[PDB]
Design a binder for this molecule. Structure first.
Ligand SMILES: Nc1nc2c(ncn2[C@@H]2O[C@H](COP(=O)(O)OP(=O)(O)O)[C@@H](O)[C@H]2O)c(=O)[nH]1
Ligand SMILES: [Mg+2]
Length: 171
C-alpha cells in the first residue's frame, strides 16, 4: 500500500542495472545495454511493511524523458553507486550527490552510498575510504555484489529505512 520511489545513479559500468535486476528478478545479468533507462516495480516486505518499490535505473542519456524528470524530482531516495574496482566511479560520486541536493533543494535527501562489485579482487577503493566519504555526507554506506546478491537487499531496504526517517521528520 505504501510506495517508495527510488533512483539508482552512478557512473557508467558500476552495476546500476545489474543491482536493480538482481533486486527485482533475483538474477545477475551478464550484459544490459548501458543506454537503457527504465523503471522497475516489485511488491516487497521490509521490516514487516508491505510496499511497492518503484525504482528508476538511470543511464544518463541526454534525450528527454518525462519519466526521468518525474523520478528525480519526486524520487524519495537515491542509491549513489560506484564500483570498488573503479577509482574514477568513486571520484564521480560527489557530482551525483551534488546534483541530487540541487533537485531536492536540500542537504538532507534520503540516500545511500553503494560500493558494488565487492566479489572482485581488483579493489582500488578501500572500505575506510568509502566509509569516510559516507561519514561526510551523513549517509549509510553498503558494499554490494549484484553477482552474488551480497548486500543488494540491504542497500535498497536501508534506503527505504532512510526515507521513513525523513518522512517522519517532515511531519
Ligand atoms: N563481478 C561483478 N560484475 C558486475 C557487478 N555488477 C555489475 N557487474 C557487471 O558490470 C558490467 C556493467 O554492469 P551494468 O549493470 O550494465 O552497469 P551500469 O552501466 O551501471 O548500469 C556488466 O558486465 C555486469 O555483468 C558485480 O557486483 N560484480
Ligand atoms: Mg545500465
Amino acid at each position: 500500500m505504501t510506495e517508495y520511489k527510488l533512483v539508482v545513479v552512478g557512473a557508467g559500468g558500476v552495476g546500476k542495472s545489474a543491482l536493480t535486476i538482481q533486486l527485482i528478478q533475483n538474477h545477475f545479468v551478464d550484459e544490459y545495454d548501458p543506454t537503457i533507462e527504465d523503471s522497475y516495480r516489485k511488491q516487497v516486505v521490509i521490516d514487516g511493511e508491505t510496499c511497492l518499490l518503484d525504482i528508476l535505473d538511470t543511464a544518463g542519456q541526454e534525450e528527454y524523458s518525462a519519466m526521468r524528470d518525474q523520478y528525480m524530482r519526486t524520487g524519495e531516495g537515491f542509491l549513489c553507486v560506484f564500483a570498488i574496482n573503479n577509482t574514477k566511479s568513486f571520484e564521480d560520486i560527489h557530482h551525483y550527490r551534488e546534483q541530487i541536493k540541487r533537485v531536492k533543494d536540500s542537504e538532507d535527501v534520503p540516500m545511500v552510498l553503494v560500493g558494488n562489485k565487492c566479489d572482485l579482487p581488483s579493489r582500488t577503493v578501500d572500505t575506510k575510504q568509502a566509509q569516510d566519504l559516507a561519514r561526510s555526507y551523513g549517509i549509510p554506506f553498503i558494499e554490494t555484489s549484484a553477482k552474488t546478491r551480497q548486500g543488494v537487499d540491504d542497500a535498497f531496504y536501508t534506503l527505504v529505512r532512510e526515507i521513513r526517517k525523513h518522512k517522519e521528520k517532515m511531519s
